[PDB]
Design a binder for this molecule. Structure first.
Ligand SMILES: Nc1ncnc2c1ncn2[C@@H]1O[C@H](COP(=O)(O)OP(=O)(O)OP(O)(O)=S)[C@@H](O)[C@H]1O
Ligand SMILES: Nc1ncnc2c1ncn2[C@@H]1O[C@H](COP(=O)(O)OP(=O)(O)OP(O)(O)=S)[C@@H](O)[C@H]1O
Ligand SMILES: [Mg+2]
Ligand SMILES: [Mg+2]
Lengths: 87, 357, 58, 190, 55, 45, 121, 401
């Protein structure tokens, strides 16, 4: 019984030790030196996106998009094929 | 090993991580005709004595650099470029001073690794409790820092300008009222000694006043350095009472108990119980006898009767901040928290806000 | 008991030494000056520096 | 399967992993840190060429970077808005429905708020000038821009936008019975 | 009806940078809270271990 | 890479000082992802 | 399998007496503590296991086998070969399936002449 | 280009309850002292908590702000000076200052504030942003319906693209002060004598409902009625934080009576169980028609959005941000979310941003100010002293939208 009690007290202490946060920091190599990739079943590769601060504009290619308009309408102009003719 | 340096307004505590007590404790003062520490106080007659840390805040950064240089080279006799340095800052320190600490450590001393910790959380580490309120009273300032799960709450922090230096000046005045001579600038050190040896906190100030006026059994004698002996009585507790009655000094402010209660009340209702159960006293100005019981009775008067009050005042609370710094620097989990030289080089002195809390 | 169950402290992780001449992962250490190095040119430079320093010191 | 969020996904989210050396211990990375020394940083004044006044703010920057052009100044470029003379207005842009000072107020607001016509409408001085709908502001602005371009492109259709907003308002204001009806139709017509 | 296209203005880049900085603030606060909790519970375990070892 | 363990759902975000940070999202199956050895990213030189 | 991180015996009163020997094993995935039968103390000292050794312990027999110092403690200045091994990847506890293809003739040859009599043979 | 630039700017958010201040780049205000200050007619000003809580003869309790806007510029200067000297501990001419302002602040008041900041405090740069935009910025949202319920007003402010749509501002007088008055009335009905803690020399434990056994402090000086009212308000606000709770749905007497009572102890040792009246009081914020034409908080929300462009209403409902101290009453956010989900059109997604903590609710404007001041792209926006030399009247209204 004393051993059963001490093992339950040990499992309680281990649970307390594990409920506390496990990781807070990762290596510099992972942070900057290595890029993160994913390869699918066809062999195509995707690089993990990096949320960077805004990049300065080189030209006027940075077209503005109204994020509130996109809540009611979709972001692409309707193709002329499905557009009804001129009234 | 890591270096734990606690820079205080009156005296600096320096030492190595994991040690029980600081290896070197010396006054924080620079003397220019530059001599720092007890060498400077030995030469009052030829040096201009200035304190760089006022109310926990650095004023002259060159003096602070000189104090750190003296610490590393003469006090601990170590190379700063070999050891990580864990510094302490007073609560509500300006951001620019914390940046300057970072810059000075990396660019003048080329330290390998650095961290800046708040002094109250280190006192709480030394207490060994997760949640509590620290009432740290040093030479020049008194703070009441509530801490929940190790995260200080900056908004609820309350600061009191009353501290042991003003208590030294008040005991000097009271001794002059008894007719003893202490007004000259060196004899201030004798008032400090008699304050540290004989002063005590009254549990009930009016009862002690009446008893010491009625009976001479409460009086004690102290021998001045020149061989003269003085007897001080009633005065033995009028000085510490100024912590609880700052109107004695003419400062219209709340007492330390009232400041602690107000700082607790500034916190969330739910976490107040843990703060009341863990009221930690640190700093030299809290070393007076009976201060734990007087604080207990005052907080119990202010706090609800359904709330359990427990003042924690260990015998080592004069160094609690540095013991906590040493415990933190010796931790395995803390080793990931060091600001590295490379991090400073790539992110600048503002790295201290990104990593340290 | 303590012979059969010694409580050995886990060994310290070694210093990943670097060559002070070229800042490459250290492969060697000079027997005389006990300074690690990574190439023959580093060894020659280190020994020239050591002879100059021992001349200056005494 | 994946998660999306802006700031953070839930209160129970694990903390971010920050990079740092010495996580594997200081002793093992002692030689690397001791081999190098940091570059000096300075609290220095900087010119921002996006500002027209020339005021100098301060930075933490490396010593070698002192005096370099402010990088955030590259973002500074305004939405293109035409400018017309009094003569060009008198010749081309006159409309009995619009005062010149009213149009100048509209175009000043447009230059202020980057053609965000909802913000222009909110800031439009309806007290001094006549009350205008956002369609009226868009109509006047795009008409003037088209006319100036022609004198010196998707045209605006005020009626279509007016009908679109009126329909949206009608769809919004309807009672809960009148949306229960529509959803009951949408589910029963399937 | 499609508005006439325009490139991003200074204010658009300001609002993008604002969104990025707000994210960084929230995540840094969450990290500092969790790290403080971790360190303090480790210190409490260091004292509990010391007490159990010296007893 | 250190530890060689799936940390679960994360995103790479640049921090204030240029520091690249991994934000992490809670999931009920986080323990299963810890035992794990869908779009699943891994670092490479 | 894992790198040895602790070997603390668990003392007790007998109804020094030990009732368990706790071994902590570390792999790249994580760390596990095992509550082994005290009799495994003979095999630990026979294998001369110390902190920083990669070992493996089979569930059935309970005998430990030592396979070297973890390479995280190897320097480029010390010379040994067989005594270092990389820190194991994967979970500390592993279930391995080994499939071998043989012929009955292989078994015949093996049991007919197993491999000082061996020296002369 | 890179991370936002920190130029050592200060962020001040002076509200009617607490003055929130700190350095830009921090995630929390390093100071928050009560806005109410002590005044002695000579005037001598006692400003922070350490000074306010001690009795003084002929000292009145006043506030520089009126209806969310500063009225007494002398007390405002006193608060600013105290903030600088005690908490900031830096010269005003050395750090740029970004201050928040009410959604409805008048042009003349803005000009007066800018004139004060430049002529008196000699600051190098200045900016004045609205509290609602900063609250939105604290949450990384450029658009959304801010709902702020402090002590003075419950206000819905629609923000679109970082701009307050002033036409959609709806303000209600029901706020923390209304709750304080309601608690005062409740205490009066129950004949509880509100004894501020400063008058109590000692107290003894008593049972619930028992008369208070407390000893009055001796040698107490005469105090003004304003300071006594302020101390009573402090204890009432402690009661509000500790006891009151918003019902998860429309208040019902039977359901309220079923739920367990909550015990509170007054400073003089008096204690009681507050039963169901603790739920009735906060109900006025949602259903003012039952309080002995004000609009409920959910009606303030739904009215404010209805005054905006229907192109933007989907975004306003899609980003509802709750801020202010009065929103920290228990279950306030849940009740508000329930009511808004019940009233919102099904065709639009409604989402209340989940940040519900004291720091995130009370300091949100300051957090947004710090975020804005730390942006490199924002460094163009500052009003410089050289700009104040020419456009001291002209540009101050034009530079800060
Ligand atoms: N036994 C004692 N009893 C009471 N006061 C004491 C005692 N010993 C020292 N003091 C006083 O306590 C103070 C000790 O200084 P510290 O506590 O280190 O303050 P400091 O840390 O230097 O300054 P701060 O406020 O922390 S920045 C001095 O004012 C001493 O006079
Ligand atoms: N935790 C809490 N629970 C309940 N009420 C609270 C809490 N904290 C603060 N309050 C109340 O919230 C109000 C103050 O909220 P704040 O928004 O901080 O006021 P303020 O913003 O400084 O001034 P205004 O009115 O917004 S101009 C007071 O009525 C307080 O009593
Ligand atoms: Mg100290
Ligand atoms: Mg407010």
């Amino acid at each position: 019984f004393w051993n059963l009690k001490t093992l339950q007290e040990r499992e309680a202490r281990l649970r307390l030790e594990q409920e506390e946060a496990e990781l807070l920091t990762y290596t510099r190599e992972d942070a900057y030196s290595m890029e993160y990739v994913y390869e699918d079943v066809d062999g195509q590769t995707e690089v993990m996106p990096l949320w960077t601060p805004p990049t300065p504009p080189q030209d006027d290619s940075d077209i503005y998009l109204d994020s509130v308009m996109c809540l009611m309408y979709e972001a692409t102009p309707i193709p002329e094929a499905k557009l009804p003719p001129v009234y | 090993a890591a270096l734990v340096v606690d820079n205080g307004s009156g005296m600096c505590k320096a030492g190595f991580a994991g040690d029980d007590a600081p290896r070197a404790v010396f006054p924080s003062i620079v003397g220019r005709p530059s001599y720092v520490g007890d060498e400077a106080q030995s030469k009052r007659g030829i040096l201009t004595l200035k304190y760089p840390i006022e109310h926990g805040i650095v004023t002259n950064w060159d003096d602070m650099e000189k104090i750190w240089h003296h610490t590393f080279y003469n006090e601990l006799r170590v190379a700063p470029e070999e050891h990580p340095v864990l510094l302490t800052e007073a609560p509500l320190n300006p951001k620019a001073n914390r940046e300057k600490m970072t810059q000075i450590m990396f660019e003048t001393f080329n330290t390998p690794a650095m961290y800046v910790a708040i002094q109250a959380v280190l006192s709480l580490y030394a207490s060994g409790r997760t949640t509590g309120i620290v009432m740290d009273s040093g030479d020049g300032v008194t703070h009441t820092v509530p801490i929940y799960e190790g995260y200080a709450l900056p908004h609820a922090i309350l600061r009191l300008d009353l501290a042991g230096r003003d208590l030294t000046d008040y005991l000097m005045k009271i001794l002059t009222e008894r007719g003893y001579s202490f007004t000259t600038t060196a004899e201030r050190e004798i008032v400090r000694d008699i304050k540290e040896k004989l002063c005590y906190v009254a549990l009930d100030f009016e009862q002690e006043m009446a008893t010491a006026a009625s009976s001479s059994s409460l009086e004690k004698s102290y021998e001045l350095p020149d061989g003269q002996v003085i007897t001080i009585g009633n005065e033995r507790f009028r000085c510490p009472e100024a912590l609880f009655q700052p109107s004695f000094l003419g400062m219209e402010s709340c007492g330390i108990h009232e400041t602690t209660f107000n700082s607790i009340m500034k916190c969330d209702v739910d976490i107040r119980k843990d703060l009341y159960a863990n009221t930690v006293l640190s700093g030299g100005t809290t070393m007076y006898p009976g201060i734990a019981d007087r604080m207990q009775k005052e907080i119990t008067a202010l706090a609800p009767s359904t709330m359990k009050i427990k003042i924690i005042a260990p015998p080592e609370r004069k160094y609690s901040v540095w013991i906590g710094g040493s415990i933190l620097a010796s931790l395995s989990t803390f080793q990931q928290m060091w600001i590295s030289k490379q991090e400073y080089d790539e992110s600048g002195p503002s790295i201290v806000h990104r990593k340290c809390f | 008991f303590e012979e059969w169950f010694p409580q050995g402290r886990p060994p310290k992780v070694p210093v990943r030494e670097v060559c002070p001449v070229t800042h490459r992962p250290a492969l060697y250490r000079d027997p005389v000056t006990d300074i690690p190095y990574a190439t023959a040119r580093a060894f020659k430079i280190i020994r020239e520096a050591y002879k100059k320093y021992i001349t200056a010191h005494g | 399967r994946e998660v999306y969020a802006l700031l953070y996904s839930d209160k129970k989210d694990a903390p971010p992993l920050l990079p740092s050396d010495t996580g594997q211990g200081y002793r093992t990375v002692k030689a690397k840190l001791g081999s190098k020394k940091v570059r000096p940083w300075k609290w220095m004044p900087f010119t921002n060429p996006a500002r027209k006044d020339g005021a100098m703010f301060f930075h933490w920057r490396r010593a070698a970077e002192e005096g370099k052009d402010y990088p955030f100044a590259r973002f500074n470029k305004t939405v293109q808005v035409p400018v017309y003379s009094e003569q060009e207005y008198q010749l081309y842009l006159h409309d009995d429905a619009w005062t010149k000072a009213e149009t100048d107020h509209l175009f000043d607001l447009s230059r202020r708020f980057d053609l965000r016509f909802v913000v222009i409408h909110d800031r439009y001085d309806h007290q001094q000038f006549k009350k205008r709908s956002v369609e009226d502001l868009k109509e006047r602005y795009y008409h003037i821009c088209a006319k100036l371009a022609n004198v010196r492109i998707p045209v605006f259709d005020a009626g279509h936008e007016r009908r679109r907003k009126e329909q949206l308002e009608r769809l919004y204001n309807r009672t809960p019975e009148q949306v229960a009806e529509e959803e009951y139709l949408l589910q029963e017509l399937r | 009806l499609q508005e006439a296209p325009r490139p991003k203005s200074h204010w658009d880049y300001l609002l993008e940078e604002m969104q990025w900085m707000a994210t960084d603030f929230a995540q840094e606060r969450r990290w500092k809270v969790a790290a403080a909790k971790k360190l303090v519970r480790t210190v409490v375990r260091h004292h509990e271990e010391k007490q159990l070892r010296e007893e | 890479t250190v530890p060689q363990r799936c940390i679960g759902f994360a995103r790479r975000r640049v921090g204030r000082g240029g520091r690249v940070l991994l934000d992490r999202a809670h999931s009920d199956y986080d323990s299963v992802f810890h035992h794990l050895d869908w779009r699943h990213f891994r670092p490479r030189t | 399998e894992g790198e040895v991180t602790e070997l603390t015996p668990c003392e007790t009163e007998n109804p020094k007496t030990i009732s368990h020997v706790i071994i902590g094993l570390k792999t790249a995935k994580g760390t596990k503590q095992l509550k082994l039968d005290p009799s495994i103390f003979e095999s630990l000292q026979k294998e001369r296991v110390e902190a920083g050794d990669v070992i493996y312990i089979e569930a059935n027999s309970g005998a430990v086998k030592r396979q070297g110092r973890c390479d995280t403690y190897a320097t480029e200045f010390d010379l040994e070969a067989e005594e270092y091994v990389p820190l194991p990847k994967g979970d500390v506890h592993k279930k391995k399936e080994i499939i071998q293809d043989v012929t009955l003739h292989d078994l015949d040859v093996a049991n007919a002449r197993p491999q000082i009599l061996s020296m002369m043979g | 280009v890179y991370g936002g630039d920190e130029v050592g700017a200060l962020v001040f958010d002076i509200g009617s309850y607490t003055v929130r201040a700190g350095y830009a780049g921090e995630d929390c205000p390093k100071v928050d002292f009560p806005t109410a200050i002590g005044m002695v007619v000579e005037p001598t000003y006692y400003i922070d908590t350490n000074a306010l809580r001690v009795p003084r003869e002929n000292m009145e309790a006043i506030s520089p702000l009126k209806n969310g806007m500063v009225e007494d510029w002398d007390s405002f200067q006193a608060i600013l000076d105290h903030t600088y000297k005690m908490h900031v501990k830096s010269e005003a001419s050395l750090h740029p200052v970004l201050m928040s302002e009410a959604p409805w602040n008048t042009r003349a008041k803005r000009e007066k504030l800018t004139e004060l900041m430049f002529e008196h405090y000699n600051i190098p740069a200045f900016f004045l942003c609205k509290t609602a935009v900063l609250t939105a910025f604290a949450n990384g949202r450029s658009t959304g319906l801010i709902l702020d319920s402090g002590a003075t007003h419950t206000t819905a402010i629609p923000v679109h693209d970082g701009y307050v749509l002033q036409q959609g501002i709806v303000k209600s007088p029901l706020a923390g002060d209304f709750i304080t008055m309601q608690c005062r009335e409740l205490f009066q009905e129950m004949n509880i004598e509100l004894v501020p803690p400063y008058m109590i020399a000692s107290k003894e434990a008593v049972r619930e409902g028992s008369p208070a056994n407390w000893k009055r402090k001796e040698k107490l000086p005469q105090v003004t009625r304003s300071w006594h009212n302020y101390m009573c308000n402090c204890v009432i606000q402690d009661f509000q934080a500790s006891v009151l709770q918003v019902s998860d749905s429309t208040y019902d007497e039977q359901v309220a009576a079923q739920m367990p009572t909550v015990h509170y102890e007054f400073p003089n040792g008096y204690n009681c169980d507050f039963g169901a009246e603790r739920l009735k009081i906060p109900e006025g914020l949602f259903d003012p028609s039952n309080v002995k034409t004000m609009l409920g908080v959910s009606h303030v929300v739904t009215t404010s959005v209805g005054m905006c462009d229907i192109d933007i209403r989907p975004g306003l409902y899609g980003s509802v941000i709750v801020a202010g101290g009065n929103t920290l009453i228990q279950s306030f956010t849940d009740r508000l979310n329930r009511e808004l989900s019940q009233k919102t059109p099904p065709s639009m997604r409604l989402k209340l941003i989940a940040n519900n903590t004291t720091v995130e609710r009370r300091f949100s404007s300051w957090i947004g100010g710090s975020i804005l001041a730390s942006l490199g792209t924002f460094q163009q926006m500052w009003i410089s002293k050289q700009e104040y030399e020419e456009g001291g009247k002209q540009c101050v209204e034009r530079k800060c939208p």
